Amino acid sequence: DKRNAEYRLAFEQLNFVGADSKTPILKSFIEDKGTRIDEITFESMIPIETWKSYIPQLQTSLNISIISIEQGASKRIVIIKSMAGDAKIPKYLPWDDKYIEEQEGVVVVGQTFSGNIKIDLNKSPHILSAGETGSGKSVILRCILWQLLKQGAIAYMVDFKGGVEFGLEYEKVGQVITEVDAAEKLFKYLVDENAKRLKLLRESGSKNIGEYNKKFEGEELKRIIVVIDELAELMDKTGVDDETRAKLVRIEGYTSTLARLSRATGINLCIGVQRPDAKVITGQIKNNVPVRICGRFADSKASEIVLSNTKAKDLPEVKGRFLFKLGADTVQFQAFYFDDDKHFIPNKILKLRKDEIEDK
Structure with missing residues (x-):
């Protein structure tokens, strides 16, 4: 629930709200440790196109590297294919x-x-x-x-x-x-x-x-x-x-x-x-x-x-x-x-x- 409240805040800040004033509710956080990539799912009243244009604002807030924003089961469900903001890449x-x-x-x-x-x-x-x-x-x-x-x-x-x-x-x-x-x-x-x-x-x-x-x-x-x-x-x-x-x-x-x-x-x-x-x-x-x-x-x-x-x-x-x-x-x-x-x-x-x- 630490992750739910940390997102709630980042959204709350960006004023990332749906047509119903409702912020994006978190659904699933798939921690693939093997790939270091995570499947973050939200149910909101914000079309994918709008999430897509706001991708830099999201990335910087939530400290993440978004790969893709594929629409889920329904139009309100959206899955953010994304990995950590602490991109572990070597110097030499x-x-x-x-x-x-x-x-x-x-x-x-x-x-x-x-x-x-x-x-x-x-x-x-x-x-x-x-x-x-x-x-x-x-x-x-x-x-x-x-x-x-x-x-x-x-x-x-x-x-x-x-x-x-x-x-x-x-x-x-x-x-x-x-x-x-x-x-x-x-x-x-x-x-x-x-x-x-x-x-x-x-x-x-x-x-x-x-x-x-x-x-x-x-x-x-x-x-x-x-x-x-x-x-x-x-x-x-x-x-x-x-x-x-x-x-x-x-x-x-x-x-x-x-x-x-x-x-x-x-x-x-x-x-x-x-x-x-x-x-x-x-x-x-x-x-x-x-x-x-x-x-x-x-x-x-x-x-x-x-x-x-x-x-x-x-x-x-x-x-x-x-x-x-x-x-x-x-x-x-x-x-x-x-x-x-x-x-x-x-x-x-x-x-x-x-x-x-x-x-x-």
């Missing part, structure tokens, strides 16, 4: 190998208010990390790569800045693609590999490699992970000769093909973008890339591309503070500080690899 989040998931295909990206953000690459298969230069953006992808490498995945890194963001260390664990020629060979291969895989899956009678891999263990399908340091490196023809203009288009057709058909076959794309543009994050790419990571952008246009809303502006001036987006919802999180010197250890991967081959 250092990486630790303890976070590596045992569920093959799952990757942690950082910590939200409740807990660590997980991603099932069998559910949502491709990641788009956008953020201006001044770090963060790619560090999230390199961190994801490490997790999958540790889960025994096959890596392909794509870096046209002559393989600078993926050093000789990364070349120990996989192929680093630095030019249009290799990028063409590669994206063509992956497309043919995805093709060979859809055959095996269909015939085995499995919907994804998660299913298929529970069915075959001696010979399993290795997950393929494709990191693209910068997309615009591939996504910009504006200058090249006819021969190259063709290659970059061929590459645009393969990327589109994989992005649209991969989910089942275990071929995952992680894309970095320093500045969103519709000529870079094209139709297909955005259409087929579920996960969206967004950095502090002062441009509303850039936010609309990736997040398809303008929440990137509203981010705090903290390094690692990003916005994860899957489906409709968007959360504020501190990503892991992944240092390629201390955290990336190629030997550990070569170890797993010797250890897996020293069987069958």
Whole structure:
């Protein structure tokens, strides 16, 4: 009843009253400790639209973070999907190998208010990390790569800045693609590999490699992970000769093909973008890339591309503070500080690899 009287007061203050002078009466307070989110229900004579416009006034009074105001059973009943006003988000989040998931295909990206953000690459298969230069953006992808490498995945890194963001260390664990020629060979291969895989899956009678891999263990399908340091490196023809203009288009057709058909076959794309543009994050790419990571952008246009809303502006001036987006919802999180010197250890991967081959 402490919560009932604390609301009664906040409403009483805001003069938040119905057509009947009656303030909103509290009905249920569902304390989901697991999700740190609470289902607060009120019966009032105040239409949802009016609760919706008064959301900032409510938030500040009741010290809460409202997510949604869904209408309940009747027009007078309204459920406020909302979490605490003491939003538990870290200052700096250092990486630790303890976070590596045992569920093959799952990757942690950082910590939200409740807990660590997980991603099932069998559910949502491709990641788009956008953020201006001044770090963060790619560090999230390199961190994801490490997790999958540790889960025994096959890596392909794509870096046209002559393989600078993926050093000789990364070349120990996989192929680093630095030019249009290799990028063409590669994206063509992956497309043919995805093709060979859809055959095996269909015939085995499995919907994804998660299913298929529970069915075959001696010979399993290795997950393929494709990191693209910068997309615009591939996504910009504006200058090249006819021969190259063709290659970059061929590459645009393969990327589109994989992005649209991969989910089942275990071929995952992680894309970095320093500045969103519709000529870079094209139709297909955005259409087929579920996960969206967004950095502090002062441009509303850039936010609309990736997040398809303008929440990137509203981010705090903290390094690692990003916005994860899957489906409709968007959360504020501190990503892991992944240092390629201390955290990336190629030997550990070569170890797993010797250890897996020293069987069958």
